[PDB]
Amino acid sequence: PVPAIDLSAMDTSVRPQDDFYRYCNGNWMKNNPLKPAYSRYGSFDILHDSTLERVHLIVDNLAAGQHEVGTNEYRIATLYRQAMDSIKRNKDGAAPLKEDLQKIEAIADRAAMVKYAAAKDNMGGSTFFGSYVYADAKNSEMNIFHITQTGLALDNRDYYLKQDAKSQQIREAYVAYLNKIAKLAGYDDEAATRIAKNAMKMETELAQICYSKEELRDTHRNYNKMAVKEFTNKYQGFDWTTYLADRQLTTLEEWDVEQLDFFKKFDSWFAKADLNEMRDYLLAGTISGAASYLSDDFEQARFDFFGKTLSGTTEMHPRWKRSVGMVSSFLGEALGEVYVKQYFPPEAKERMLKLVKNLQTALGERINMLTWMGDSTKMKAQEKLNSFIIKIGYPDKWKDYSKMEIKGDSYYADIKRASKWMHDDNMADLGKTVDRERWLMNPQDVNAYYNPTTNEICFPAAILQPPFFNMDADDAVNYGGIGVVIGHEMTHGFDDQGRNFDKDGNMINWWTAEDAQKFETTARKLADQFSEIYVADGVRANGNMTLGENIADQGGLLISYLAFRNAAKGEVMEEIDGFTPDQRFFIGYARLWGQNIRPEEVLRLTQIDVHSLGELRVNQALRNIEAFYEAFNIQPTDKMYLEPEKRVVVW
Numbered sequence: 150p151v152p153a154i155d156l157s158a159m160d161t162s163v164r165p166q167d168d169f170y171r172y173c174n175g176n177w178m179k180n181n182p183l184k185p186a187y188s189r190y191g192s193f194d195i196l197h198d199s200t201l202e203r204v205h206l207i208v209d210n211l212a213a214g215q216h217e218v219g220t221n222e223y224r225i226a227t228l229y230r231q232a233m234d235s236i237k238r239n240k241d242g243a244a245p246l247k248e249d250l251q252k253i254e255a256i257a258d259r260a261a262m263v264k265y266a267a268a269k270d271n272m273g274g275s276t277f278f279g280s281y282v283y284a285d286a287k288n289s290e291m292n293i294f295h296i297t298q299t300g301l302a303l304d305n306r307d308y309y310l311k312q313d314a315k316s317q318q319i320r321e322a323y324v325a326y327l328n329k330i331a332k333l334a335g336y337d338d339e340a341a342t343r344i345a346k347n348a349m350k351m352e353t354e355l356a357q358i359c360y361s362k363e364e365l366r367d368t369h370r371n372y373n374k375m376a377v378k379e380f381t382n383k384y385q386g387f388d389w390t391t392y393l394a395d396r397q398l399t400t401l402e403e404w405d406v407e408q409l410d411f412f413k414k415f416d417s418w419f420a421k422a423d424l425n426e427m428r429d430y431l432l433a434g435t436i437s438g439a440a441s442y443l444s445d446d447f448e449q450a451r452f453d454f455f456g457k458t459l460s461g462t463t464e465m466h467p468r469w470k471r472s473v474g475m476v477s478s479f480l481g482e483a484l485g486e487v488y489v490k491q492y493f494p495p496e497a498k499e500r501m502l503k504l505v506k507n508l509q510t511a512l513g514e515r516i517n518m519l520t521w522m523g524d525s526t527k528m529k530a531q532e533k534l535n536s537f538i539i540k541i542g543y544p545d546k547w548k549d550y551s552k553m554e555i556k557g558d559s560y561y562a563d564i565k566r567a568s569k570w571m572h573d574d575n576m577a578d579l580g581k582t583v584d585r586e587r588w589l590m591n592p593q594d595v596n597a598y599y600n601p602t603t604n605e606i607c608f609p610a611a612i613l614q615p616p617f618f619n620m621d622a623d624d625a626v627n628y629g630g631i632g633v634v635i636g637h638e639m640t641h642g643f644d645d646q647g648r649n650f651d652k653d654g655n656m657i658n659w660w661t662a663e664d665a666q667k668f669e670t671t672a673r674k675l676a677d678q679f680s681e682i683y684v685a686d687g688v689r690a691n692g693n694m695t696l697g698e699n700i701a702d703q704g705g706l707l708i709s710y711l712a713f714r715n716a717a718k719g720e721v722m723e724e725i726d727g728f729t730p731d732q733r734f735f736i737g738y739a740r741l742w743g744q745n746i747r748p749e750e751v752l753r754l755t756q757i758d759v760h761s762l763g764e765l766r767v768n769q770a771l772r773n774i775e776a777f778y779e780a781f782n783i784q785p786t787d788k789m790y791l792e793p794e795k796r797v798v799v800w
């Protein structure tokens with residue numbers, strides 16, 4: 150019988166009323182200092198790592214055997230062995246990159262830049278901006294074409310623009326990274342520094358006209374469907390008509406310009422930008438995008454910046470972990486099929502479905518018991534909740550990889566073939582009915598998700614294991630673990646983004662203005678509540694960026710606690726390990742989040758992660774949960790206590 154709670158993780162010298170996070174995790178945290186390759190390590194990573202070890206065996210077994218060309222076993226074995234083949238990768242050096250760089254150097258003028266972007270984007274690139282095919286937000290049954298602002302290497306545009314000393318140091322390390330890899334690619338000292346500085350200048354200019362991370366979360370702002378000619382007739386600084394023609398999209402009548410104001414400013418930036426500076430931007434981007442796929446010196450330069458500088462790590466993960474991760478990103482469902490055959494019991498799928506339906510019923514009750522919302526919006530909320538698509542364990546049909554060509558000539562060349570396959574597979578959806586059954590994660594992912602355009606909640610097999618889902622545990626702990634996860638994904642249907650989408654996945658208003666304003670006032674109170682909290686000295690939590698996840702955590706806690714009480718109706722509350730079932734619910738929840746984390750990684754996740762830090766998902770989120778105050782008799786002098794007027798309950 151797998152224990153329901155690791156009691157040894159707990160630090161019972163801490164009062165649960167003062168620091169519940171360390172009460173439930175503080176001895177695990179003392180006994181598990183971070184290893185050099187980890188920027189953060191906690192319960193999710195434990196389960197991730199043990200799942201990865203299972204996948205490691207699957208992949209190593211395939212790599213040891215013989216397979217026919219054109220099977221998935223051949224594709225997996227060949228990608229993985231090439232990634233693992235440090236002798237060949239180090240022998241080849243930068244040679245696999247040579248022709249790609251020559252193609253960029255040959256771009257003769259601005260017109261040729263446009264055609265180059267179309268050619269690389271036809272391979273899956275994002276030369277100056279992103280583009281993708283997926284459901285129309287306002288017609289979720291039809292696939293349309295979307296364009297999005299420049300993907301930035303540092304992710305948050307603020308890294309490029311903030312004027313303080315620590316931000317300048319990060320920028321200088323990024324430029325040193327580009328200089329290092331340009332030298333490794335064969336440029337002399339002068340050209341490598343020129344390329345690094347020009348690339349950073351171009352990327353900083355693009356970051357300036359990008360939307361902020363918080364602004365990218367605004368649903369209505371980032372949808373702008375229109376006739377193509379309406380935009381391309383007016384904004385001709387970038388020759389969209391030639392670009393679209395070379396992407397074979399001349400007959401495309403409409404598109405979704407997601408960051409419309411970025412593309413209006415991009416019109417002038419592209420028309421006026423120095424050609425040599427743009428070429429250097431393209432060179433640095435191509436080298437950086439190849440740096441995980443060549444010789445050790447490239448991969449270590451990349452680690453020096455993205456690992457050591459940005460995250461505080463001092464070692465790379467072992468090569469097999471990077472290699473399994475790469476294979477899983479291109480052939481993940483082929484691996485997922487083997488994984489579930491070997492490790493996923495059917496009893497888990499059926500027990501999980503009963504659990505999800507119990508949570509759905511509890512959420513129906515929470516919505517019925519709201520009093521801040523009028524009856525008419527409440528009825529639309531129930532309609533949405535009753536139409537969740539539930540996906541558990543694995544997809545009912547597996548992805549067909551048969552057109553993916555893997556040759557084994559070089560790691561980088563096959564990476565490009567795998568990416569081309571994924572790109573062609575995406576473009577093939579254009580103008581076709583949306584496949585609503587598709588999984589956006591693999592069975593072996595230790596995670597779960599909500600998707601607004603299908604109104605689906607999805608629970609991969611790998612997350613249905615202890616400490617989330619433990620078929621031997623008492624109910625209280627399973628509700629505190631996977632039950633809160635389920636309710637968290639459900640609440641995403643009703644957070645500041647998902648509330649905009651209806652039961653069919655369409656971005657259609659189902660709110661009265663008055664109820665929406667009330668939601669927005671209450672949500673802003675939860676945002677400001679978290680932004681009062683310090684994640685490090687002088688650094689506030691970003692309550693705005695994490696607002697959707699904090700709403701979902703709170704919803705998961707309230708829904709799952711209600712479902713747990715429902716399930717306990719007609720039973721007497723037996724203590725276990727000296728804890729009431731109510732206390733075991735909260736301890737089981739807090740045990741999901743115990744982690745150690747490097748100071749650098751605290752700063753990085755505050756800039757890029759919409760999820761709060763694990764410590765705040767326990768110590769801050771629970772301060773709004775009245776049932777938690779009761780379970781541990783929290784008084785006004787306890788450090789966990791929040792004054793009632795400052796508490797906020799959204800749903």
Ligand SMILES: CC(C)C[C@H](NP(=O)(O)O[C@@H]1O[C@@H](C)[C@H](O)[C@@H](O)[C@H]1O)C(=O)N[C@@H](Cc1c[nH]c2ccccc12)C(=O)O
Nearest residue numbers: 191193194596597598599633634637638641744759760763
């Ligand atoms: C309630 C929770 C158990 C499930 C929940 N999944 P959820 O956010 O809905 O699913 C997806 O997660 C990421 C892939 C995306 O960035 C999100 O926008 C969302 O779509 C979550 O917190 N996922 C975390 C889990 C996680 C990943 N790495 C971790 C390291 C430590 C602790 C937790 C984690 C995450 O994706 O961040």
Ligand SMILES: [Zn+2]
Nearest residue numbers: 637641698701
């Ligand atoms: Zn979430």
